[PDB]
Design a protein around this nucleic acid. Sequence first.
DNA 1: GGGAAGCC
DNA 2: GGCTTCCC
Length: 336
Amino acid sequence: MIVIFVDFDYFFAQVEEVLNPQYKGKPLVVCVYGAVATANYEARKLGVKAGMPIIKAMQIAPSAIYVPMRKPIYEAFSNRIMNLLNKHADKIEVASIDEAYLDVTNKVEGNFENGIELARKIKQEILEKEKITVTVGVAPNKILAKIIADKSKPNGLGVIRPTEVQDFLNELDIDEIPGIGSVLARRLNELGIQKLRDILSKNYNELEKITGKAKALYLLKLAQNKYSEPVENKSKIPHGRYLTLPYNTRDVKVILPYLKKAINEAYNKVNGIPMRITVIAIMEDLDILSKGKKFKHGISIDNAYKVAEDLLRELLVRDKRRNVRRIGVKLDNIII
DNA sequence: GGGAAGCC
DNA sequence: GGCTTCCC
């Protein structure tokens, strides 16, 4: 398997800089309501990092611009670029607006050197046609392609050939294993294991008592290099809309038209078929009821109306007391 | 099943 | 926020 993984570099801020060239070179930070969304690198070198209150941002980065978040344009860019990547790939799994996994194995016919050259070609094209720069990792499975991409930011072309895999898998701190953030890392680092391969010479059972059977297994077959969940033709990008009701009703014969309109425009922002539908509702006190059903086969818009109606009715059966103010729908797990 | 708690 | 695992 040859997996080329593409992650867009500080995306939002860069869509900005492309749109406003006079942002390029001076700190530019993007906001969500207020807190930091993305942030370019001239702004990074000053202590500006995602999720922090704009407060700290300004106090440590005063020469910085501060724009609001225009998501629709970013989604425009990510859409154009995903379509770029869809042409050089045999299979593509869209993980987010930011990132894609391409199985390009038949495209370079099993030849890793040709895969690397292809990644080069991809970068060149993305930057030529949309002035955007990406950080790429090339590897035999998804996880390593990613680990080497995150290790190759910014504007990088990371690389782990089959020859290198085992070696890499050795020298690899536990905290650099996606799915282990800060606390599990602290525990294992403080309870024995410092690096991935150290997991092998343990008792496994009392590793599950720290992580859970699943994630422990995953850590194994990764330490064993027995990992190869393949690249699926899917988008994990959520698509859905919320609509406010005239008053605070609690009656399906009023909500239904508003839910059916939420669905229609969620089912229109999506190319492909969803495997999950989630009905969401903001109650009187803004309390939110989330409730979704999964479908191994795709869900048609027509059957989506009925399934949603049932999800809703089931929600209102869960509440009985309060009424509904807003109505919402999310469509997930998308086959393409 | 599904609300609650903890970990990305 | 969303995914799991806990726990009723």
